[PDB]
Structure 1
Amino acid sequence: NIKSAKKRAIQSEKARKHNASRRSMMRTFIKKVYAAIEAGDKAAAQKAFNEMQPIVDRQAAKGLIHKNKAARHKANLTAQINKLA
């Protein structure tokens, strides 16, 4: 409707696309981690955890994951590897 709501519509669409991509990459890295924990692999899962840590902290800082969630992930996953190793 005829306003500056049109601009918020198009910006929220653009940011929807950007956030969906970054959120999807973050979730795939976390799937790498506890999909490596599905098999009994310690150092493979540690390599995947070191691969996911900067991106989850980074998406926490960029403002789309709200860092406590960031913390939870790494906390949960650390538990999984010292349940395993």
Structure 2
Amino acid sequence: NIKSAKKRAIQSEKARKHNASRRSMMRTFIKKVYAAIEAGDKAAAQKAFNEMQPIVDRQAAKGLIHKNKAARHKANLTAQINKLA
């Protein structure tokens, strides 16, 4: 119904707005690397790796991404470029 505690809803509305934008840009950093791997530009991807790391790990510590989730991308993708490296 119409409860005073609906404030959590409009709050989550305001929350999901930026939460959308946070994870959206987050995965594009990851999408940057997949564009690189398909080609092979490892150094630039590595420049982007220590570039996407501080932004993704930052997402982990905030509360949007679970620490193991963000670490998972640091896990496989390191081996991915390492398949080339």
Greater RCO (CA < 8 Å, at least 6 residues apart) = 1
Structure richer in helix, relative to its length: 2
> TM-score if structure 1 supplies the norm length?
0.92
Q: Distance in 2 between matches of 1:54 and 1:34?
A: 18
Match of 1:8 in 2: 8
Q: Structure 1 vs Structure 2: percent identity of aligned residues? A: 100
Instruction: Give distance in 2, aligned partners of 1:68 and 1:80.
Output: 18
Whole-Å Cα distance in 2 between the matches of residues 38 and 21 of structure 1?
26
TM score, norm. by length of structure 2: 0.92
Gaps of 5+ in 2: none
Alpha-carbon shift at residue 2 of structure 1 (Å): 2.1
Task: Write the deviation string for residues 38-62 of structure 1: whole angstroms up to 9, x where unpaired.
Answer: 1011201111111100011000000
Task: Number of aligned residue pairs: give it.
Answer: 85
Runs of 4+ with deviation above 3 angstroms:
none
**What displacement does 1:5 show?**
3.2
CA RMSD of aligned residues (A): 1.0
